[PDB]
Every structure is written in structure tokens, then in C-alpha cells.
Amino acid sequence: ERILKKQPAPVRALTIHPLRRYESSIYDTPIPAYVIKHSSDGVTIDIATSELADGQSGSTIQPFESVPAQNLTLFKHDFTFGHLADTTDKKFVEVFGVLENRADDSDFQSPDMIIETETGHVYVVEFTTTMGDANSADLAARNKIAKYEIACLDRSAIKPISLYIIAVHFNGVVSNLDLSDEEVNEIVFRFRLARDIFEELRE
Ligand SMILES: [Mn+3]
């Protein structure tokens, strides 16, 4: 019997912490070799994680990956963020139910994460990437906020919601989470490696 579920109600409202610019501080760090091979559905990838130093950016990377042909278009986004959450089609409706009598489009939106805690807060987290610079990243982040703000606002009447964004570019992250340098480095490092792999995969 979980006692945190027995607290007085929290304020039902949408919270958005301000976005911040972070920059990677990677420098000369080995980038693992990868071997791409044709497979039955798509490609197999073999990442030489042995080449990485202990305590260096990239320690979250797994040596082996299967990418089916239907998943190559999402590979960059999903690989980049694969240490924080696995791919999902978990919709708003699974967590809040339909909002007024009738189901609508915002019920079937699927942000990258929807976390609900015992205390009754809900956290919506969305990841994204850009091939441009930090300004591109800031803009990408604002577009994800615009994509999901309405659905979050209406449902915050049911449980309070905090909306978070992580937007990666080649040299940093725009995010309203409070990230360490290692955490920024890991995201960027995984993004840079995903870019290299993706250019050979589209080919
Ligand atoms: Mn995303």
C-alpha cells in the first residue's frame, strides 16, 4: 500500500522550465568503428566498443544493433536517445483516457516519454535532432513544444504535467532539463555516431 498516493491534491496546471543552451566538451575522444551488413529484414551493425576508454563519452553504446528496413528512417533519433528511453507508441489516451466524451487526435499523440509518478505528477518528454547549428536546435525544440503544448495543457486539468524537450545538434543540446556536461556529451556523442552510420545506411 503506497502512501505517497494518499497526499492532498497538487495544483493541476502545465509547467515548462526554460530552455537552455548546452555545448559539448568532447574534444579528441575515440569514436568506435562500425561494420554494417545486409540482413534478412534490413541491416546489422557491429560497434567496436572495445575501442572506447573507461569513463569516456560513449560508454552507454551497445556493441550490436538490428535495424529492420522499416526502421532506418527513425534510426538517427532512436540511436541518439537510446540510453534514455526505448522507442514507444504509448499515447496520451493510455494515461489520461479520452478527454471529453469523444476521442480526438490529441488523444493519440505519442511523445517520446510519458512518465507518471506516485505523487500524481506527469512528465512529458520529447526528443529531437537537427542537422544545423544551435539556432536550428533551439527552433526544433520550440516546434516540439508547439506540437504537444495543447494536448499537455488540456490534460493538465487531470494531473499536473511538466513538458521537457531535448534537442541535439552537432555541438550541443538545447534542453530545459538540468543536464551535466557528461550527460550533454553522451547525447552529442551518440548523435555524431548516428550521423556517420545514417549516411552509409541511406545508401
Ligand atoms: Mn522525438
Cβ partners under 8 Å of residue 134, min gap 6: 21, 23, 169, 171, 172, 174
Please indicate, yes or no, if residue 129 is contained in any of the structural domains. Answer: yes
Resolution of this model in Å is: 2.4
Asked if residue 158 is part of any domain, the answer here is yes
What is the distance in A from the centroid of ligand 1 to the CA of 166? 9
Say if 55 falls within a structural domain: no
Cα separation of 118 and 4, whole Å?
Answer: 6
* Whether 167 contacts 140, CB under 8 Å: yes
Q: Are 133 and 171 in contact (CB under 8 A)?
A: yes
113 is a domain residue: yes
- Contacts of 28-31 with CB under 8 Å at 24 or more apart are 29/53, 29/56, 29/57, 29/58, 29/189, 30/56, 30/58, 31/58, 31/189, 31/192, 31/193, 31/196
SS3 150: helix
Active site residue 147: no
What range defines the domain where residue 123 resides?
Answer: 3-28+85-201
- Centre of ligand 1 from the C-alpha of residue 194, in Å: 15
Ligand 1 centroid to 109 CA: how many Å?
A: 11
Is 186 inside any structural domain?
A: yes
Using the mean position of ligand 1's atoms as its centre, give its distance from the Cα of residue 145 in Å: 11
Residue 38 lies in a domain: no
CA 169–ligand 1 middle distance (angstroms): 14
Residue matched to cell numbers 499537455: 152
Q: Which whole-number Å values give the CA distances from 126 to 53, 78, 113, 154, 164, in the listed order?
A: 30, 12, 6, 18, 6
50 DSSP assignment: G
Q: What does the alpha-carbon distance between residue 44 and residue 22 come to, in Å, rounded to a whole number?
A: 33
Query: What spacing in Å lies between the alpha carbon of 198 and ligand 1's midpoint?
Result: 17
Q: Which three cell numbers stand for residue 115?
A: 512518465
d(CA 59, CA 159): 36
Number of domains in the chain: 1
Instruction: Given the residues 90, 144, 147, 159, select the one marked as catalytic.
Output: 144
- Within a domain: residue 62? no
**Residues in Cβ contact with 194 at an 8 Å cutoff, skipping those fewer than 6 apart:** 75, 76, 79, 80
